[PDB]
Amino acid sequence: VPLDGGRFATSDLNDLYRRVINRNNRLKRLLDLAAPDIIVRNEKRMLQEAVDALLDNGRRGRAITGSNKRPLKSLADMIKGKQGRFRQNLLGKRVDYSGRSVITVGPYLRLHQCGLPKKMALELFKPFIYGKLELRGLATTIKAAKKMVEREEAVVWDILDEVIREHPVLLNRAPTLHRLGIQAFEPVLIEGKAIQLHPLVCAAYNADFDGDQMAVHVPLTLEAQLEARALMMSTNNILSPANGEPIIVPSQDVVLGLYYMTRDCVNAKGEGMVLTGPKEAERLYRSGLASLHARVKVRITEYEKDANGELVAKTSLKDTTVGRAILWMIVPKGLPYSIVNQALGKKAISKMLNTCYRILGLKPTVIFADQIMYTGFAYAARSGASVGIDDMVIPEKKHEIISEAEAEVAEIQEQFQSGLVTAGERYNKVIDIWAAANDRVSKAMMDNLQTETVINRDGQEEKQVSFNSIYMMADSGARGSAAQIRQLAGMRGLMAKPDGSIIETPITANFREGLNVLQYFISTHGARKGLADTALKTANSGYLTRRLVDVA
């Protein structure tokens, strides 16, 4: 390629062919002049090594270099390896009619809808705009339509809404680990420069909203659009291929909203009153005449399909809350009521969606999933389930547990220094006792944080399941587990080095009270372990899936 100026590109193959032709011509000239046998033998050696370097460079003892002392590539380095033609330009290619932008939430969408920026769709669906502009006669030739599009006239914006109507696109993330990495959505043209994504598929995508880029793709031909509509559509991809569990699981806001709604405590604005259905429960809660955690006896009409596809009616009077009564309004006709009459966590609603799919089908399941989305977001916004520094409560007995563990490890000191156990055995027992102490502190804190609440039912004090915010977002399973919250209050535990070995000394402090200047240095080991484990040992796990997809 002629670069900027008089120089040329330093293409490897050209230099190798130049060297080979040099050796061949010089050898031919020497053979024509009847050179001494040692000279022509040496030149034959030079020709052989030049041809060797041209065919497969680096297989000999030394790989030749042209500039910067860098081993140049031959005819084999571009056929073999990670940068060869097979893996770089054959099994995967750069693709036109594509785009890429940072994604935002826009939770007003549905499972069959995505959000494209208004400017990306004009560059993506440009030939479609050209075709319809030529069809309607608003333009005359291709270049006139090109100029009209580049000038972004008002008519082009009107006709864009026509091509973009029911033409599904391929939303795609950069690491496509599994089958659900590419899902097809219909586009909804919006302003801005961000690709809005429906949060119900963000768990499947593993696409957090912390600055990641997704890639769009436009099915051009008819069959591609029909495949995206019938196969790769996100509506028909609500069951992961890994197992029978659903993959559209609400998470991290909807679970919290549902769990805070479908819960009961013994007091309210109105508690013992009776209602004739979900509608009056909604009327009570909107007006504020009854709390969302009341314990009332509404009259509901749940359906059953004991017949061969016919729903038989029944009406009962069950003792439920106001929140569960409100939630029953969106449940499709046909599921038993004994699915929301509890504290709906994440696994609970996952099982609920699974049984909805198993009983009713696909369309009620997707409609109900969207309704769960809406009624989780609304009552999570109204909840105000915040987090303060007064929510992580330190148990008053963790230091007794660390004292007992310190006494036992001091006993272990005398155990190994005398000779009863050795250094490796001491290391195996010290981790044992530290893990036992960590497991005791975690359980003690969890009990103290889940049961320590006092409330009166209009009389003496009674105990209920706690309303601490951290407990809500650790029990609902929206985002959290025992590990993170356990490290937020009580014992952080013992961390591991990148090689997999565990530190002999667990740091004894929690993030709610603080860390020393030395316990932080010790936790640095685990913090670096996690990152240098991800970035440097996901390679030998992507290799596994590569050579697994290869073999099957």
Partner RNA sequence: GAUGUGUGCU
In this structure, what token pair is assigned to residue 338? 């004994």
Residue 221 C-alpha from the chain's centroid: 31
Question: In this structure, what DSSP letter does residue 86 have?
Answer: I
Q: Does 33 bind DNA (CB under 7 A)?
A: no
Site for DNA in 213-242 (CB under 7 A): 213
Residue ranges for the known binding site are 208, 210, 212
Does the protein bind other proteins through residue 548 (CB under 8 A)?
yes
| Contacting residues toward Mg ion, per CB under 5 A | 208
Q: For residue 16, state whether it binds other proteins (rule: CB under 8 A).
A: no
Q: How far is the CB of 70 from RNA (least distance, A)?
A: 6
Return the half-sphere exposure (C-beta side, CA atoms, 13 A cut-off) of residue 223: 0
Q: How far is the CB of 501 from RNA (least distance, A)?
A: 24
Exposed / middle / buried, residue 268 (Cβ in 10 Å: 0-12, 13-18, 19+): buried
Element (H, E) at 190: strand 182-190
* Among DNA, other proteins, Mg ion, none, residue 209 binds (CB under 5-8 Å by kind): other proteins
> How many beta carbons lie within 10 A of that of residue 181, not counting itself?
16
Q: Treating both helix axes as pointing N-terminal to C-terminal, what angle do 154-163 and 142-150 enclose, rounded to 10 degrees?
A: 100
Longest dimension (CA), the chain: 120
298 to each of 83, 313, 326, 334, how far by Cα in Å? 67, 17, 11, 19
* Binders of other proteins in range 152-191 (CB under 8 A): 170, 172, 175-179, 181-182
**Does 276 participate in binding RNA (rule CB under 7 A)?**
no
Report the C-alpha gap between 185 and 218 in whole angstroms. 11
Sites for RNA among residues 24-83 (CB under 7 A) = 68, 70, 83
Distances (CA, A) of 453 to 258, 456, 462, 466: 22, 10, 9, 6
Residues 287-326: x where in contact with other proteins by CB under 8 A, - otherwise, as a string: -x--xx----------------------------------
Binding-site string for DNA from residue 397 to residue 436, where x marks contact by CB under 7 A and - marks none: ----------------------------------------
Binder to DNA among 12, 15, 52, 227 (CB under 7 A)?
A: 15
Instruction: Give the separation between CA 333 and CA 102, rounded to whole angstroms.
Output: 39
Nearer to Mg ion, 158 or 208 (CB): 208
Q: Which does 82 bind (CB under 5 to 8 A by kind): DNA, Mg ion, RNA, none?
A: DNA
The answer to whether residue 208 forms part of the interface with RNA (CB under 7 A) is yes
For residue 158 the two structure tokens come to 């009107």
Any long-range contacts for 268-273 (C-beta under 8 Å, 24+ apart)?
268/293, 268/294, 268/295, 268/322, 269/294, 270/294, 270/296, 271/295, 271/296, 272/296
DSSP E strand boundaries for 135-259: 169-173, 182-190, 195-196, 213-217
Q: How far apart are the first and last CA of the chain?
A: 42
| Side-chain-side CA neighbours of residue 71 (13 Å) | 12
- Binding-site entries for Mg(2+): 208, 210, 212
Segment lying near DNA (by CB under 7 A), choices 156-164, 239-247, 346-354, 529-537: 529-537
Pick 208 or 406: Cβ nearer Mg ion: 208
Q: Which of 424, 540, 548, 551 binds DNA (CB under 7 A)?
A: 540
Contact with DNA (CB under 7 A) among 2, 36, 90, 92? 92
**Is residue 7 at the binding interface for DNA, with CB under 7 A as the rule?**
yes
533 touches DNA by CB under 7 A = no
Residues 212-231 that bind RNA (CB under 7 A): 212-213
Identify the residue among 15, 52, 56, 439 touching other proteins (CB under 8 A). 56
> Is position 13 an interface residue for DNA (rule: CB under 7 A)?
no
Q: Is 117 in the site for other proteins (CB under 8 A)?
A: yes
User: DSSP state, 393?
Assistant: P
Residues forming contacts to DNA in the complex (CB under 7 A) are 3-4, 7-10, 15, 18, 22, 59, 66-69, 80-82, 87, 92, 94, 100, 174-175, 213, 534-536, 538-540, 542-543, 546
